[PDB]
Structure formats: C-alpha cells, structure tokens
Design a protein around this nucleic acid. Structure first.
Lengths: 34, 168, 121, 51, 32, 106, 100
RNA sequence: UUGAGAAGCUCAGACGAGUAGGCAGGCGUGGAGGUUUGUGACGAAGCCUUGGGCGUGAGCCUGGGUCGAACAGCCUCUAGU
RNA sequence: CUGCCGAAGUUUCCGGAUAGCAGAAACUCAGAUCAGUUUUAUGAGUAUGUAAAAUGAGAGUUUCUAGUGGGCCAUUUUUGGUAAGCAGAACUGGCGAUGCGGGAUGAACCGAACGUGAGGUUAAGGUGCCGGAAUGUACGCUC
RNA sequence: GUCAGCAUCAGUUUUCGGGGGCGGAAAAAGAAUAAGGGAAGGUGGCUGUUUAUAGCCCUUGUUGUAAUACGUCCACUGGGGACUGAGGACUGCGGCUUGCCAAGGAUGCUGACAUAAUGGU
C-alpha cells in the first residue's frame, strides 16, 4: 500500500480560482461558429 | 427577452498549452448564465474543449449600434427536426438584431415546432443592399411606395350601447 | 385574558346519527378501513390534544370563574378567599332549606352562585 | 428575555442596538466626481463590434 | 355535438396501455 | 330624487374558494366602476354593508344590516376581498352590496 | 464593534472599487480581466422531502436542508461543488451579495 | 413578590401521519374499609328535557319536569366492571 | 378515552435459530468517533478497489424482548428472443403503516407529507362559463 | 357588560410612489454642430443621375463629464390596506439627554347600546 507511504512522507484543498490577467495582444480571440 | 452576449473563453493554462487560444462567440440568451452555458455547449461540440478544463474570460452584452434604423437580418440556423439534421436560412426586417432573433425563435417554434435547445444559431448578418434580399415578402417591404390599410384591427365595460365602428 | 374556546361543537361518534343503538359518546374507530379514521375529505373531526384549551382559561366559565360544587354552607365558607376565582354551584340534591342558607351565606361572602335561583323561589 | 422578535431592517431602535455604526454610514457618496474618463480600448471596441 | 363516430377521449385503461404501447416501441428499438 | 346614495354599488359574487373548497370567512365583491386591481386600491379599507329586510320589527325597523370591510384586491378584473362581521349567507350570491366612501383618505 | 464595522464596510467598498478599476484598465488596454471565483454560495432547497433518492437525501442532510425553502451558506470548494451537482435538481444555489 | 401540593413553580428551544409492537396517564360501574360536624319526604335514586356550564376526550356538573326512599365526593380495597 | 415511541416488510444457517430493523436496563465515552455524502492520493481495470481533507452529527458498545420473514408497480442494465406479445435476472425506487392540492372521475401520474387556529405566500395545475383566477400581451400556424 | 369609530405604537404582511449613489461601449442611441465618404426604396431636376427647389446612409470631431433605459445599492424617504396584541411590579440591550424613548409582546381618547348588541342552542 503506497498510500501508507504517502502519509508517512507527508508526516487544505486547492482553493477557488485566483483572478489573473489574460493577455490577448499575443493571441487575439478567434470568432467561433457551430 | 433575449440579449446578445459576447462570450470569450479558453482552456485553463497548462504546461502543454501555456498560451491557450481564446475563442469568441456572439450568441443570444435571456441572461448571462444561459449565454455562458450555450457558449460552453458550442465550444465542446466544435473544439472538444471540456468545461472543467476551460474558463470564461469575458462576458459582455452588445447593444444595437443603430436601434432606430430599420434593417434586414439574414440568419443561418441548424434546424433540428424529426430527422434532426436540417439547415435553414431566413430573413427578418426590423430595427434590432435581438428582435430578429426573437422573431426567428418565435417563427421556428410556430412553423416547425422547434425548441430553444434544438435550434442553434449559426450566423446572423445584416443585408444592407436591397438586391441581396431573397424573400418576396421582404422585397415588398422595401418597395418605395409601401402603403396598405391596417389589417387585424379588431378595434371591462361590458354591454356597449352602440355597435362598434370597426372602420375609419 | 378572555375565555377562548378552540371549539364549541362536541365530537359525535361516527354513525351515531344513523343508529339509535350507537350513542353519541365519542368512540375511537378501530376499523383499519375507517375513512374518518384516515381523515378523508368531508369527514367529521376526531378529538385531538391540539384541540385542548389554554391552561390559564381552562375549566373556567364565560364569566371567568371556575365552578365549585357546594353541598352545604360549610363548603361555601371554603370559598371565602377564592371568590374572585371560584363560583359556588349548589348541588342538585340539596334541599330547598339548605339552598336558602347556602345562597344567603354566599351573598355575605360575596361569592357568585351559578344556580342561586333554583328551588329557592 | 426576548418575548418578541423585532426586525432591525424595520425597527430603527433595534438596528441601533445591534449596530453602533449605522448612525454614521453615509451610503450615498460622490465617487464619480470631477470628470468621467471614458475608458474603452480601440482594440476592445473593434472585437465587440466584430462579426 | 362532436360529429365523430368514437369518443376522442379514451378510458384510463386505454391510455394506460398506450404508455405500454410506447413501452413496446422502446422495446422494439432498443432491444428487440 | 338625485340627492342621496353616498355609497358605491357592489355585488356579492361568491366566497374566496378553490375549485372544491370554500372559505366563507372572506367574500369576493365586485365593485361596479372598478375594473382593475389598481382601481381596487382606492376601495381598500372602505366600509361595505349588506342591507336586507326581515319580517320582525327589531328596533321598530324591518331593515337589518351586516357590516364589513374591503381588505385586498382579488384578481386582475377589479374584484376585491371583503371580511364581514358575520360571514355573508350563501344565498346572497349575486345580491347588492353598498360600499361606503369612509374611512376616507382623499 | 463600531470600529470593526467601519473597517469592514471600508473593506467592502475598496474591494468593489478595486474590481471595477481592474476591469476598466483591462478594457482600456484591450485585455481581459477574469473576476475572482466566488468563495461563498447560498443554497436554497426547492423540492420537498417526498420522492427523493437516498443519495440526495443524505447530501441535503449534510447541507442541513431538511425542509423546502430552507437556505444555508456554504464555502464553495471541490467537495461542495460536486455535492451541489448531485442534488442540483433539488436545490438552487448562487453567489450572494452583501445585501443578501 | 409572597410563585415550596419539590409530586410544586419557572425559563427556553425543537417537534406533532402512523399498521404490528412497546410505554404512559386518565374516564366510568357493582361491592368493601376509612373519611366528608356529607345529601335527603322542604324530595334520595331513577327517568325525561329545542335549559345552562365544564373537559381534546372517556365523561362530569346543573335548571325545569316527572318521581317517591334512599344516595354521593374524597383516600384505599375488591371484581361476574 | 387521550398521549408518547414506532417497525419489519428478509438476509444467513438447519418450521427453529442468528442477524437486521424498535425499545428498555446497566455501563464508557466529548484532546471521540461516526456517515445510504463528496473530494485528494495511491495503484489497478469513464468507472473500479484501497487510503487520507470537506460537510454534518456527541459518538460507542453489552445484556434482553417484542413484532416482522410478503408482495405489487416502475426505471435502467442485460439474457434470449417472436409474425406480435413477452420471458429471465439484477438495480434502487413508489405503494405499502399516509391523509392533503391538482390530473373531469382513479391503487399506482404531477405536487406535497398531517396537533388546533388567524394572516401572508406558493407547488402542481390553472385564469371563456360551469370554477376561485387576464374573453391578458406579442409573434405565427390551422378550416 | 356588549359592540363600535379613531389615534399613537409593536409584530407579520401586501400595494403605490418620490429622491439619490454606483455599474455597462464609464449604456447604445439621439440632438445640435464641423470635416470626409457613400449612395439609394432616386428628391428637385434631366429611364438614367448624386443635394440642388426633399433628404438618407457611413466615419470622425464637437456639444459632454449629455441624457436616458436597464442592472445594483441607500443603516434615503412619503402614503394606502389587512391580520395579530401573546406577556403582566422592577431588572436587560440601546437611543435622546436625573429624566424622556417606537428600547425584553397595546395603549389612549371617545361613542352608542342594553326595553340589544354579542355569544349561544
């Protein structure tokens, strides 16, 4: 059981997303159609 | 009341794709929540982009630049019917792109009994030149001397004393 | 704190109207198919503890006094300190002579009598 | 204690009890004073009025 | 009145078996 | 004869009810001249009376009255809900009621 | 308490202003500013206690939504997000604002 | 502040379908011991009544009528209840 | 007469025991353990099994003593099929012990679960009349 | 004792308004006024043309920090309606200033009516 090892080596879940800037000058949006 | 929404989104950045492509759609929905749902539906069915892997980077309502200028809008749609595979093109004359789409949805649900989820709008364009108009009823609207008597007039206070004029 | 009654009608036993052999005294329906026991539409009501009246005004007459059965004058004197709480009720089998003694003594004590005018007139 | 529940959103005295700050709130404030700096990127306007 | 030769409204047993007929159609397509 | 009738004419339509269950505590009253819930707002709180006649001469008069008050509008057509001191008899459906102009707030 | 309330209200106004300035600059720069993902969710139970699968019944028991029209506050995270997905037909949830 | 029938008083919150089953508290009847300075020919018991009142209820009290010799409350006992 | 608690609705072994569900009695336990739940991690084949954060709830045993051991209906997977029905499982649901609103009427449909009431607001379904509520608004189709 | 009317409050609630922040393309328009472009479902003119003896569309400037709609907020505000009044010396939390208060649950002012109203049966 390697999970037991993991606990021994280890001896809060990922929070909601952090706001971050998104650069579009490098990558302008491309309009999509179904 | 439908609203036109610019929805731009992309998959969450990863080591394989540190600069994911940003995809934009102009799609109509009563509210932003519906628009972002419809955007995810189209993105999944085209680019196979999972909703969890993706994220919505921008949502913006788009008002009509010229709501007081009568126009003609041509709409290409993917009609879902008994066979579930049909393409249609329709033209509506009005002053707003939202109004034309609302008329489009009402017309299709009326004539072809197609629901909102079955219908997917492919593209909406503004036919500015009278010549590209393909519909005879629309062309009769663009005639210069358009004039016609008002149809479908029909007009608590029950028990009226006299008879209705129902005329001029 | 006025006297409030949650209900004025009695709880008549089911089908007691149709049959004379079935008295009006309430009997709990034991039939596993009794529609009234199941509380169907339009059925008559059944006694419930929720129908119970306020403990403060329970056992009280419309005048606000509780009835106390009195057999002779000695019982009347027992209501000396509770004349604002209790009303004397003379027993049915108390004779006319003792009624006049009970009523007169109750008048002196300022104690209400529920049936002071009976067999006394 | 507390025989009756009084709503601070309707009872001013109860709100004053609960919040010793509502007496100095000043909800309506001039923040868009001076001039309004119309801030709309030309790139953003083009993509907005695109397609 | 109605000018029809049959009652357009069926019996509850008749509509119940129609949902069973709809069940049969699902059986024909899915498994049968 | 045109010097009286300081009241508004109304009709006792029915009781506040569902399809099968009636609630006789409150009645539905159609005030004539009132054709919307906005107009019904004017008559809210007015005093409505049911006037009837009896054989016995109580107080030396054969005219009896049941009082009541308009409470809230009922529906979009201008009918209102009224609560009377004595719940109106079910035989008075379609009978004439009198809506007073008081308590006035004009 | 008055000083704490003043600090909290000033924090709310500063956060609202900060988000608005952050959006305005990106719009002016032509770039896209994603808002913060909501940490708080308000959940209202819309369906009653009748005809519920046992899995959903257990989840709404953990959410303490034992009655119709009952609302609670939840911290929005992975375990909450998927639990709300299971009972999604039975409740409605959204991001509450300060007035709510 | 008198509100210690401590088996009493008081404050607060939640809850209320319910078969089989389980548990608790009450109503009523015949008789027995105790008690009420108990009721009664100036009317007991019973009966009748579109009289009144009390109890969620089982039931209880009472007015009027009829009636004519006995009966009840409370505490316990008992059962052909 | 009233009140309170309240099932099982069937495994597992030879009609009986064991267990399960419900209570009682007597214990220890709150720096503790649980869960018809979800995440995280490990492997293995979108699921699986194992282990370790979220949320909720005080969580545990022992004795001993009642009642229960059916069925019906429906979904999904699957096994065959047959003029066509259907037949065989599994699965958890609903009824069953349960009234109430709606579906004209109803064992299985849609809502909703019950002390006595006043007020307010809704679900499902509805607003021509019977029938409480728009002979509403807008766009079409149909004779 | 009964039943009324009103007022000032408390609780729950419903229905109309008024004012003011903030947000978005820091609404879109639009109006007025300067450039340029294009034309028509072609006006005056002469079927064809390019603002003239009608005008329209597109872009930019300006008037601008325009307004308005919509969304959101006000510990902003003015009215109408209905139901309820549990509790019972004083404590408490607060507000205005010993006191006063809408602050741990209704009082006040009147009427009428008992030869009846109410509550019954």
């Amino acid at each position: 059981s390697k999970c037991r090892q993991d606990f021994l080596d280890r001896v809060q879940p990922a929070p909601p997303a952090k706001a971050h800037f998104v650069s579009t000058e490098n990558n302008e949006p491309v309009t999509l159609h179904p | 009341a439908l609203k036109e929404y610019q929805v731009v989104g992309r998959k969450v950045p990863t080591e394989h794709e540190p600069v994911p492509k940003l995809f934009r759609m102009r799609l109509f929905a009563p509210n932003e929540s519906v628009a972002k749902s419809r955007y995810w539906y189209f993105l999944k069915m085209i680019n196979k982009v999972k909703k969890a892997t993706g994220e919505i980077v921008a949502i913006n309502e788009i008002s009509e630049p010229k709501p007081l200028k009568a126009k003609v809008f041509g709409i290409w749609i993917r009609y879902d019917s008994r066979s579930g595979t049909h393409n249609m093109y329709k033209e509506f004359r009005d002053t707003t792109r939202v109004g034309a789409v609302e008329a489009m949805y009402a017309d299709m649900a009326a004539r072809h009994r197609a629901r909102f989820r079955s219908i997917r709008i492919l593209k909406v364009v503004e036919v500015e030149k009278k010549e590209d108009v393909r519909r005879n009823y629309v062309k009769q609207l663009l005639n210069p001397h358009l004039k016609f008597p008002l149809p479908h007039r029909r007009t608590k206070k029950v028990f009226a004393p006299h008879r209705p004029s129902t005329f001029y | 704190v006025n006297i409030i009654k949650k209900r004025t009608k009695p709880f008549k036993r089911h089908q007691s109207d149709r049959f004379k052999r079935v008295g009006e005294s309430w009997r709990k329906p034991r039939g596993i198919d009794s529609c009234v026991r199941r509380r169907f539409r339009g059925t008559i009501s059944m006694p419930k503890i929720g129908y119970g009246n306020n403990k403060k005004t329970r056992y009280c007459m419309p005048n606000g006094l509780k009835a106390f059965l009195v057999r002779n004058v000695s019982d009347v004197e027992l209501l000396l300190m509770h004349n604002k709480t209790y009303a004397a009720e003379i027993a049915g089998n108390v004779s006319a002579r003792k009624r006049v003694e009970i009523v007169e003594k109750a008048r002196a004590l300022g104690v209400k009598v529920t049936n002071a005018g009976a067999k006394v007139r | 204690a507390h025989v009756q529940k009084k709503n601070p959103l309707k009872n001013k005295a109860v709100l004053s009890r609960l919040n010793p700050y509502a007496k100095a709130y000043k909800a309506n404030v001039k923040i868009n004073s001076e001039k309004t700096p119309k801030a709309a990127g030309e790139k953003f306007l083009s993509v907005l009025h695109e397609n | 009145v109605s000018l029809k030769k049959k009652s357009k409204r069926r019996t509850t047993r008749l509509r119940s078996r129609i949902e069973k007929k709809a069940a049969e159609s699902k059986r024909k397509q899915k498994r049968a | 004869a045109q010097g009286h009738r300081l009241y508004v004419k109304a009709k006792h339509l029915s009781f506040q009810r569902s399809k099968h269950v009636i609630h006789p505590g409150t009645s539905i009253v159609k005030i004539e001249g009132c054709d919307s819930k906005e107009e019904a707002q004017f008559y809210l709180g007015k005093r409505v009376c049911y006037v009837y006649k009896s054989s016995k001469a109580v107080r030396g008069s054969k005219i009896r009255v049941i009082w009541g008050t308009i409470a809230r509008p009922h529906g979009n057509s201008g009918a209102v809900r009224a609560r009377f001191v004595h719940n109106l008899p079910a035989k008075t459906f379609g009978s004439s009621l009198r809506v007073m102009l008081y308590p006035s707030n004009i | 308490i008055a000083k704490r309330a003043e600090a909290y209200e000033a924090e709310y106004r500063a956060a609202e202003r900060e988000q608005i300035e952050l959006a305005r600059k990106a719009r002016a720069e032509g770039n896209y500013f994603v808002p913060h993902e909501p940490k708080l969710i308000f959940v209202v139970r819309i369906r009653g206690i009748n005809n519920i699968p046992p899995k959903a019944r257990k989840i709404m028991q953990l959410l303490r939504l034992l009655q119709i029209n009952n609302g609670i506050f939840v911290k929005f995270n992975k375990a909450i997000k998927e639990m709300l997905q299971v009972v999604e037909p039975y409740v409605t949830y959204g991001i509450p604002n300060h007035k709510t």
